[PDB]
Structures are given as structure tokens and as C-alpha cells.
Amino acid sequence: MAFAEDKTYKYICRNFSNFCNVDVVEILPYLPCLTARDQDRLRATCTLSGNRDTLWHLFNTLQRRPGWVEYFIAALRGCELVDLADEVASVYQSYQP
Amino acid sequence: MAFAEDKTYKYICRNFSNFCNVDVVEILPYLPCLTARDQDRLRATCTLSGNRDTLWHLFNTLQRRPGWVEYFIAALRGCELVDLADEVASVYQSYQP
Amino acid sequence: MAFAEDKTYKYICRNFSNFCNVDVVEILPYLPCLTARDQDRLRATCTLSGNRDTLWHLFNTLQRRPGWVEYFIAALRGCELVDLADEVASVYQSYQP
Amino acid sequence: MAFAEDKTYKYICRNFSNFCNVDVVEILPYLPCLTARDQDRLRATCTLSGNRDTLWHLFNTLQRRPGWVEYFIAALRGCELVDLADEVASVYQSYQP
Amino acid sequence: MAFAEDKTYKYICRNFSNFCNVDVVEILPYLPCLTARDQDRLRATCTLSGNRDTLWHLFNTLQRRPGWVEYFIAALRGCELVDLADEVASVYQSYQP
Amino acid sequence: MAFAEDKTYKYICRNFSNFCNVDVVEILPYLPCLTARDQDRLRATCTLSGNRDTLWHLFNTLQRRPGWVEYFIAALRGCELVDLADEVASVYQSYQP
Amino acid sequence: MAFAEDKTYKYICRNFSNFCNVDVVEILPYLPCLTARDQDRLRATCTLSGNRDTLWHLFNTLQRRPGWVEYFIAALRGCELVDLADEVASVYQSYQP
Amino acid sequence: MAFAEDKTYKYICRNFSNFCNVDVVEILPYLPCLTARDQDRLRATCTLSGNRDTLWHLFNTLQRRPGWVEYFIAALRGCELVDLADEVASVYQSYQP
């Protein structure tokens, strides 16, 4: 649900600092939900501002597509950030009926 | 119909908080109904004031030209805001004969 | 002469919509007739209200100091608005003895 | 003609989404009509704002100089956007006497 | 307490110049008390107007949400602005019962 | 003394044009004597109306609260308008017992 | 009730200075009871005259239309002025039979 | 002298178009007269608005500190803009007693 998605995103920003390792350029191919465009923005942002900065735009960009959370859990798993994926899914499923 | 357009726009502000996602700078390319001026007015506003803020200016500008609702529904769809577009179209059709 | 200058400015507003192409910030480097303070006013206006809009405020500012017309034709030529400059000069010289 | 160029640009924005593949940084060397300065602005915008995005600034920037459409048709052809140039040229010549 | 928060914010502005290093874009991610939007406004402002400048909008923006002081002290510590955090917390606790 | 402060402001406006250098948006952070409101008023004034214009509104605002002179002299020094500050302090101390 | 709404508003002005945090430009999107023309006036006022100032004009406009209190309490909540919303509702319900 | 500096700045704007080659990001390190902060503004402006545009803010920014002309001449010389440096210095000494 959107309410769950929205609460997830709120969690992530609560805890953004922990996430870091998340690699924007690595993570994007796993997010076909993002506009073929919006990836460019993130990917170009990263060149300019460095990863961890752009990470913030990406999540804000990620939470933009209904259904995004499932995409993301998949993404971290593609990124072998399994412990992180497990961390969000916990948060995510916590807000589902 | 206009009655439908105004009810649509009136709906939009009622439920604006939900819309949140529309990316001003993103959606404008789909809205050739808007004044070549007024698009500059939006984006420069976007630069000065940030996105969601500029969003509001965009809608008020949008509802100014006859036919905008179809333009808008098309726009959201290019922005893959399908659920958002489907939501608007519903509100729109609901007011058609 | 002033009569020519005034007829020119009146021409410009009577054909204002046609000019648009003029970029205000650029009309600004080439135009030392404008007060060091009024350029700030325009550009800040330009940022705030967008270009075409700011253009009108720009011309309105420009026609205030004797000699502005020569400055302007030079400016467009610096902006490679040669056909535009050629148009004004014609309009301008049409009002010279 | 001015009228023909303008309809083209209005056509382009009607159909902008289709254009996308157009590469701003690639296309700029082919546009000596654009100000040596403006290219910088597009090229820097592109770095800041991403390609398809800056694309929009570019067309709006391109249509700024009379004669631009031929420059543009030439450009697409230099960019092996033969199908695109043919698409535009069609639109352009459709508006010439 | 509210009284403590305001005295703190008044202190911050008393002593703003010392703060400078504080990086708006770096520090915002630690500040979920700020609206997901007002960070855009700070950040877009930051892009437009520069860092230390936006720092100011941010503090005025930060002091907007009850409980913000705790949020800020935490943030600076994450920004390894330990001496700064120590400095404010000192100011802060000085105004609590 | 109050008598000293007023002669100073009368000095400032009688020499207002000389000051310009003072950057309105820049100087405000040094002036906590100003109401947390009134800074909004100046800056917003600055944005719509431009700097030197706003300077007058700034000075006009500043001279309203007792003690402002010490604040202002300090401010200019923060703005490294040392010669400007030196000029005012001279004017200021010239009117003290 | 209308009387309850009025009693709330007098509370507001007697405590107006406290309530300035309300960000005018921010709050309007939650208030569809306001006349679509009349919001422009607030923002135009807000921009011209600054926020806290505009708050008062906003309130005076808001209390014009019956039912506004529910609109407002909701509004603050959207602004995560939960404590502020919590403050008003108390004052409000204290005046209902 | 101040008289000399301003006449130079006026010259600079009267010939600004000629100057362009001046590279903002390159030139700033040679100007410790500008506030370490205003470099950010220029350096960030260059980013948003392009190099030709920011040069303009820079000179107006440069002419802001008494003594700036010597700094600028030094700077251009640091920038191997020897012909440019000779051009300005000539203009400068032309207004000294």
C-alpha cells in the first residue's frame, strides 16, 4: 500500500545515514520503475556531487513511482546488500494490512 | 466540458497533497497548451521556489486554457504517473454527459 | 532625436510580442546606459517573473535615458539578433530628419 | 520563412517526447547559430540537469535565431538522425509557400 | 522546552558567522523534522543562492518545527561538527529547568 | 547616545549612494537587532526589488532600534567593508560626549 | 458553530504572535474553502509584504467562510504542525455544545 | 583611488563583451579580496548560468571591494591574460593623480 510505501520512505530518511554503501550507479539498472530519464539525472548528479549526496535524490526519486518499494527490495538484493534489503522489507511489511 | 474541467481542477486542489509527485520541470514538456511564457514562469519559479511549490503554480496556469485536462492526463501518462492519471481521468469523466 | 526614440519605443511595444527573442540578461551586458542599479532590478525580475515578462519591464527601463536606441541596436547585434536590429534601425531611422 | 520555422518549433514541442534520443552535447557543435555562450549554458545545463532535459532548453534556445531550422535539419543529419531530420524537414517544408 | 529552543535559535543567529562550515546539503539529510518539501526549498535555494546563504534559510526553517533543536544537535554530530554540536547543546541545556 | 545615532542615519542617507556596496541579503545575518520578521521583509524586498533599493529599506529598518549603530559597524566589518565601517564609526564617535 | 469559529479566531489574534510559524505560502494548498482568486492575493501579499505579516491577512481571509476551522486544523496537520493543530482543536472544541 | 576604480569598472562593463575569455572558476583563486563566501556564489552561479553569465556577476562583485582593481590586474596576470591585464591597468592608471 501507498501508506506502507510512504511510511517506508519516511523510515529510510529517518535512517538515511546508515545506508551509504548503497551504490547509485550500481543500483539503478535494478529500477526500471524510474524514468529512463530520471536515472540520467541521478547518474549525472552522482558525477557531480558524489554518491552519498545523490543517494538522497534517488530515494526521493524512487518513492515517486507507486510500487517502488518492491523494486527497491529487489535492487538491494541484486546489489548483495541483503542485510539492507532485509532491513527495509521488515519496515515495509510492518505497514501492510 | 468546462464544468468537468473546473470540477477536475477543484478536485485537484482538494487532493493536491496526494498528487505531490508530479514533477513540474518534468511534466511541462507535455503541456503545449501552456504559454511559452508561462512555462518559463513555472520553471524559473521551480528554480527559485522548489518543485512542489511550483506545482501549484503549474496547475493554476494549466486550468487557464480550455482543453487542459486531456493534455494533463496525457502528460501524467508520459510521466508514467498512470495511477495519478487514471485518478484524474476518473474525476474528469465523472463530470461528463 | 527624442521624437524618433519615442516612436521607436512605441513601435517596439506595438510589435512587442514579435521581439520576445531578446534575452534580458544579454540586453543587460551590452547596455551601460542602464543604471548599475536597474540591471540588478531587471535580472532579479528576470529570475522572479521569467523572461518575456521581464522584457517588457526591460524596454520600459531602457527608453528612459536619452541615447538608449543606439545602445539597443548595438546590443541586439552583439546578441546576433541582426534581423531584429535591422528592423529597429529601419524603424528608428524612419523617424530621423 | 519565420512562419514556417515557428510551426516547426511548435511541432517539435507537440512531439518533443519522441525526440529524446537527440544528444545535446553531441548536437551543439552542429549549431554555430547558437551563441558561443549559449552552448556553454546548454552544455553546463546538461551536466547539471541531464540530457533529455537540457534538450528542451536547446530547442527553445535553437528556435531563437532565425534560420535555425535549416541549421537543425543539418544537425540531425550530422547526428545520423536521418529519420528525425526527415520527420522535421517534412514538417518544415509543409509550411513553406 | 520551547523557551530553550527559541533562545538557542536566537543564539545561533547571534553567532551565525561561526557556523559557516555547516553544509546545508550535507546537513539536511539528518533533519527529517523538516518537511520533505522544505529541504527541496533549502537545496534548490542552495543551488541558486549558495551554501552559507542557504544555511540561514535552513536555521530559520529548522527552528520551525517543535523538537528541532535535538534534531540539529544530532545532525552536526553526524557531520562531525562535534565542537559545534557541543557548543549548541551547551547553549541549549543552559535554558532548560 | 540617541542624538549620535540619528545624526549617523541622517549621515547615511545624505551619503546613501556611497554605501551601495553593502549587500542587503549579505549583511542581515550580522543584524540580530532586526526583528526576525523584518529580515524576511528586506530579503523578500531584495528579491522583488533588487539590492541598492532594498539597502534603503534596510537602513530605514535598521535605524529603528536603539543600539543598531554598534550592530551595523560590526556588520560591515563582517562584510569586510572595513573602510565603510571606519567611515561610519568616525561619523558615529563624532557625535558622542 | 460560527460562534465557536469566531471564539477560536479571537484566540488566534490574542496569540497571533505565537502562531507566526505558520508558513502562509505553505498552508494555502490545504485550504480549498478560500476563493481561488483570493489565494493569489495572499501570496501576492506574501511576496510583497513577507510571511508573518501575510499570516494575519491569511487568517482574516480564512475566518471569512464558515467551516474553515476543520479546514485549518487539517492544514496544520499537513504541515506537521501537529502540536499547533492540537492547540487549536482544544480551543475549538471548548466552544462546542 | 576610488574614482579610478569605478571608472575602471565602468570601462569593464562598457567593454564587457570583449572580456568573456576570463574564466570565473580559474580567476577566483587569485582574488582573496572577494569573500570566501562570494566565490561560492560566483562558482555556483557559473554552474547554473554558465561562464559568460557569471563573469558579469563577478566584475560587479569584484568592484565591490575598494582595492579590487589591483587584485583583478594581478588575477588576469595569474590567468595569463597579459593583454587583458595591460588593457585594464592602462584604464586604471588613466584615472590616478
Superfamily of domain H1-97: Death Domain, Fas (1.10.533.10)
Please report the number of interchain residue pairs, chain E to chain H, with beta-carbon separation below 8 angstroms: 16
DSSP annotation of G30 reads G
Nearest CA distance, D89 vs chain A (angstrom): 27
D78, D66 Cβ separation under 8 angstroms? no
In degrees and rounded to multiples of 5, residue G23 shows phi and psi of: -100, 110
Do C77 and C69 form a contact (C-beta atoms < 8 A)? no
Instruction: Give the other-Cβ count within 10 Å of H20's Cβ.
Output: 14
DSSP A19-82: HTT--HHHHGGG-TTS-HHHHHHHHHHHHHH-HHHHHHHHHHHHTTSTTHHHHHHHHHHHTT-H
Phi, psi of C32 (to 5 degrees): -65, -5
In the three-class reduction of DSSP (H, G, I as helix; E, B as strand; rest coil), residue B94 is classed as coil
CB–CB of E1/E96 below 8 Å? yes
Q: Tell me if C59 sits within 8 A of C52, measured CB to CB.
A: no
For residue E57, give the H/E element and its range: helix E51-62
CB E96 within 8 A of CB E4: yes
Whether residue A80 contacts residue A23, with contact meaning beta carbons closer than 8 Å, is answered with: no
State the distance between the two ends of chain G, measured CA to CA, in whole angstroms.
9
d(CA C17, CA C32): 25
Angle between the D36-49 and D51-62 helix axes, to the nearest 10 degrees?
Answer: 160
Collect all residues of chain C within an 8 Å Cβ-Cβ radius of residue B48.
Answer: 47-48
Please report, for residues E4, F60, H74, the alpha-carbon distance to residue C14 in angstroms, rounded to integers and kept in the order given: 61, 40, 49
Angle value at C-alpha C49, between C43 and C54, nearest 5 degrees: 55
Q: Cα dist. E48→E67, G57, H47 in Å?
A: 29, 30, 9
> Of D47, D48, D52, which has the smallest distance from its Cβ to A37's Cβ?
D52
Instruction: Inspect the structure and tell me whether chains F and D have 3 or more CB pairs less than 8 Å apart.
Output: no
Each domain of chain H, given as residue ranges in start order, spans: 1-97
In what helix (H) or strand (E) does residue B14 lie, and over which residues does it extend?
A: helix B2-14
Q: Is A41 on the interface with B (CB under 8 A)?
A: no
Can you read off the three cell numbers belonging to residue F25? 541579503
Q: H50's torsion region: left (phi>0), alpha (psi -120 to 50) or beta?
A: left
Q: How far apart are CA H30 and CA H8, in angstroms?
A: 19
Nearest alpha carbon to residue B17 among G81, G78, G70: G78
For chain B, count helices (H), then strands (E). Answer: 7, 0
Separation of alpha carbons C36 and F53, rounded Å: 11
* CB burial of residue E61 (10 Å; 0-12, 13-18, 19+): buried
The number of angstroms, rounded, from the C-alpha of A3 to the middle of its chain's C-alpha atoms is: 16
Comparing CA positions, the residue from B82, B67, B72 lying closest to residue B4 is B67
Q: State the cell numbers at C18.
A: 514579435
Give, to the nearest 10 degrees, the angle between helix A68-78 and helix A2-14: 50
Closest CA to H54 of C53, B41, C43: C43
Q: Which of F53, H50, F43 is nearest to C40 (CA)?
A: F53
Q: Across the interface, which of F23, F79, F83 has its CB nearest the CB of H66?
A: F83
A14 touches chain E (CB under 8 A): yes
Which of G70, G77, G67, G65 has the alpha carbon at shortest distance from G27?
G77
Residue A42 cell numbers, joined: 541521478
CA torsion angle B21 B25 B29 B33 (round to 10): 80
E37 touches chain A (CB under 8 A): no
- H/E stretch holding B89: helix B82-93
Three-class secondary structure of residue D45 per DSSP: helix
Which residues of chain D are within 8 Å of residue A37 when distances are taken between CB atoms? 50, 52-53
Full 3-state SS string of H14-80: HCHHHHCCCCHHHHHHHCCCCCHHHHHHHHHHHHHHCHHHHHHHHHHHHCCCCCHHHHHHHHHHHCC
Residues of H in contact with C25 (CB under 8 A): 53, 56
CB contact under 8 A, E17 and F29: yes
D52 contact A CB<8A: yes
Three-state DSSP state, G64: coil
How many C-alpha atoms does F59 have within 13 Å on its Cβ side?
Answer: 24
Decide if B86 touches A, using CB distance below 8 A. Answer: no
φ and ψ at residue D51, rounded to 5 degrees = -65, -60
